[PDB]
Design a protein around this ligand. Structure first.
Ligand code: NAP
Ligand code: NAD
Lengths: 177, 367, 369
């Protein structure tokens, strides 16, 4: 096994300020937090800074078909930035930072293994990204009620808090760099 | 010294008309300003405003035959019919849409009666007058339902949806004619998640469309050689071909709607494509359009809605009633009947006075 | 056997416009080694012409030739008798079946020694997600429920400010928050309505909140069978909330049963003239006492619509999704172009209604009795 590695918004800000490629991975928790506006604003900021930004939308992210699409469309995110896993997956090794926002099941690498109640679900290869910051409030499990080894990987850092509040602070700290 | 003003509101009778000129809440502001308001029994039933509500506002609910008794102002949606026209008293002003081309025989009877009438469609399209602009407020209503009807008739989703059952691509919606209606059509289709394109001759309308997040359609240029016209036509036909929905709104006052979708154009639309032709009332922007109907030719579904404002009868009446209320600042002073003849807005909208037709093109059409 | 061959018929049920496979999916099956037979005109309701199926590698044929040599019959609605009578031995029918609506078709299938997988019976497990046709079609129904409500409403959904004043957003209540309810909440919300949610399950209410909707908070915990007194309290509180809405979208249905009444006569009496109800449960009784299935009615100025085949209105995207569900499921029926049904697979086990005339589904068994 490995360890949970809490990180401060200021450290997340530094990681993001210098990245060439960022992929945003929204899940149910973004929706619960109604963090879609703060998320789009962070993606605007990085883009203005020259960062290459994309959204990875899992087929069953959230709790309804197209959950992420509707929230992101409301925020005003361009459709061209939204990718599905068939198109985004192979691109992951080149992602400098993958930012998970209230996603859990749809990024759980245990889905590749038969015993898991998540088995037979295709997964987003966030685990193959150079760096992973995961935003969630704490220890909450996902729909399937399983632990997620991704949070314990070497390249994974936890940025704890409410998704709207965390993103707001991240933006604020980024405008100060 | 002016008479104390009585305002009258009829129940509309034009076929499929459901709006009312004043809604109860607007009657109440008029009463509180000092005016008397009389309303015909059941006038607001098409807009879900019961007679009891007008009474709570301070109106007198009356029978049709009594409606114009002692009345200085007749507020209408459509022009008044013969029965109301003959009951018009000396000094009284009719205010409402008139549209002579469509209602000429009513215009004639008003002139034989020596009426004074302010035509709502003649409100000048200027800054000082937007709060009174009935064409706009009803254009906004029509553009909204136009987007709603398109999504209803389309066999495809508007929004992009990424799902366990595959990724749903957004509908491609092109709004042609981006006046007030088209702009509401854009906003509404955008709310639904469609990718929206905007087509218009004017650069300003395109900049406006741009601000709502629509993509403007740029033709190779913008009289012309016959060949440039053809290049220009072809390029538009090409842009239209890849759409799922066309909403078309171009209308010129007093003339037939321009054709924006010719036969060679609609032949390039994929089966399942939808056209909502808002211009059907003046002939339509599409050559396949049947006014008031839905038709399907080669699986292209074409709808020519007439009287959209009447579907949204609650908000259409509210906004029109508000338009009339703001216009009445030029007709009512501290509860007194005091028409401001000198005012630019009155001069521009005054269609006839004491039988004298003051509107050139109407004078011509009557001749 | 051989090369697996799958058949797809023209749907014939009243109002039905979907088709079981669309050309892009037909093409993927042909590429994988399958022969595909498609009835003449089957994709027309969904704007997929016979020529397009020919381009995908399908043979297009007469209805009478459809089933000859076929191992798989993919349908939307259960096959009518003319097709049942042509099923060959060992062939599997895959589609919605709904024996409560189609008992006598189910009896004919049994008498024929048919084997059938009912799409309504796909289990709710992670492996089956991309096969969940109940979900794909409900997503369509929820979308169009919101659209129809905006179409039948005499008011704007969105808040509007113009020179002529400010209009309040419409108040929309979605009652019953499954998949159809969620997509209805989302579409109405995007159109700018003020959206409320009524459901007994807390988790459904959390999901409605994740769409910017507002949970309708009642006095009693609904999470237990209620006493007669507590029901009176809940019913009265809910009636008050329903009273202040401009739009009600009701979507609660129970498999094999008549729909629960969510809007009783005393409730609708409290509804203002100009209020709209879109009753999505009409196919099974309706949630609202005034609903006339397949019709718009107006009583006391309340517009009530009970639509019956919303998926068939959105025939293109409904068929697309449905076809993808069958395509995904066919991974359990086809292996390298050959007919190979995984009898042991939990997904097959859950959804196998019948196998060679033996009814495996208990509730359907009882019904045939
Ligand atoms: N989309 C569909 O149609 C559908 C339908 C049925 C089932 N499903 C299933 O639902 C699941 C969806 O996966 P998912 O990765 O989107 O979600 P998930 O696996 O349910 O996990 C969502 C995560 O959100 C975090 N969270 C909750 N509130 C938050 C907040 N305010 N701020 C930040 N984080 C918050 C939670 O942890 P904390 O408590 O630590 O904050 C939780 O770990 C899949 O298992 C799918 O199979 C989907
Ligand atoms: N300064 C300006 O920006 C400016 C200048 C002139 C006119 N206008 C506005 O134009 C308004 C027209 O009123 P409306 O909002 O009811 O519009 P409308 O419904 O009368 O016209 C529909 C739209 O179609 C466009 N159109 C007309 N013919 C066309 C054609 N052949 N091909 C493509 N597009 C065509 C028009 O530009 C208009 O924007 C005037 O009232 C005024 O408000 C603005």
């Amino acid at each position: 096994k490995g360890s949970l590695k809490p990180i401060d918004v200021e450290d997340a800000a530094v990681m993001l300020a210098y990245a060439g490629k960022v992929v945003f991975v929204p899940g149910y928790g973004m929706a619960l937090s109604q963090a879609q506006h703060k998320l789009k604003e962070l993606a605007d900021l990085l883009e203005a800074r020259g960062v290459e930004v994309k959204f990875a939308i899992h087929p069953v992210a959230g709790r309804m078909p197209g959950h992420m699409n509707v929230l992101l469309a409301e925020a005003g995110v361009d459709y061209d930035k939204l990718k599905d896993l068939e198109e985004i997956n192979p691109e992951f090794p080149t992602v400098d930072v993958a930012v998970v926002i209230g996603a859990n099941d749809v990024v759980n690498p245990a889905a590749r293994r038969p015993g898991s109640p998540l088995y037979g679900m295709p997964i987003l290869d966030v685990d193959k990204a150079k760096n992973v910051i995961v935003i969630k409030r704490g220890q909450g499990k996902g729909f399937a009620g399983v632990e997620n080894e991704l949070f314990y990987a070497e390249n994974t850092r936890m940025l704890y808090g409410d998704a709207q509040k965390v993103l707001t602070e991240l933006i604020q700290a980024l405008k100060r760099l | 010294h002016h008479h104390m003003v009585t305002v009258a509101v009829p129940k509309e009778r034009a076929p499929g008309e459901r709006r009312v000129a004043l809604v109860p809440e607007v009657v109440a502001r008029l009463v509180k300003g000092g005016a008397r308001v009389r309303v015909e029994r059941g006038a607001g039933e098409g807009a879900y405003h019961p007679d009891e509500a007008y009474q709570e506002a301070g109106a007198e609910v009356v029978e049709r035959g009594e409606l114009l008794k002692g009345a200085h102002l007749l507020f209408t949606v459509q022009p008044p019919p013969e029965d109301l026209i003959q009951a018009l008293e000396p000094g009284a002003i009719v205010v409402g849409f008139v549209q002579p081309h469509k209602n000429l025989e009513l215009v004639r009877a008003l002139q034989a009666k020596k009426a004074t009438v302010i035509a709502m469609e003649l409100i000048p399209r200027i800054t000082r007058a937007q709060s009174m602009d009935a064409l706009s407020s009803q254009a906004t209503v029509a553009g909204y339902l136009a987007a709603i009807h398109a999504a209803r008739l389309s066999p495809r989703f508007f929004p992009m949806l990424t799902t366990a059952a595959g990724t749903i691509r957004p509908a491609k919606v092109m709004v042609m004619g981006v006046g007030v209606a088209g702009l509401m059509a854009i906003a509404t289709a955008k709310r639904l998640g469609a990718q929206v394109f905007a087509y218009d001759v004017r650069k300003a309308a395109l900049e406006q469309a741009l601000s709502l997040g629509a993509k403007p359609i740029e033709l190779p240029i913008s009289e012309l050689t016959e060949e440039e016209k053809r290049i220009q036509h072809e390029a538009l036909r090409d842009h239209v071909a890849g759409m799922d929905v066309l909403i078309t709104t171009a209308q010129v006052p007093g003339r037939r709607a321009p054709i924006l979708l010719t036969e060679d154009m609609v032949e390039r639309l994929k089966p399942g494509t939808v056209v909502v032709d808002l211009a059907a009332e003046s002939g339509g922007n599409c050559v396949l359009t049947k006014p008031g109907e839905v038709v399907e030719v080669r699986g292209v579904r074409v709808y020519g809605p007439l009287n959209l404002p009447s579907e949204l009868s609650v908000h259409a009446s509210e906004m029109y009633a508000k338009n009339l209320y703001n216009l009445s600042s030029l007709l009512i002073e501290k509860g007194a009947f005091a028409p401001k003849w000198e005012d630019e807005i009155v001069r521009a909208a005054l269609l006839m006075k004491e039988g004298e037709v003051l509107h050139g093109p109407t004078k011509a059409l009557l001749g």
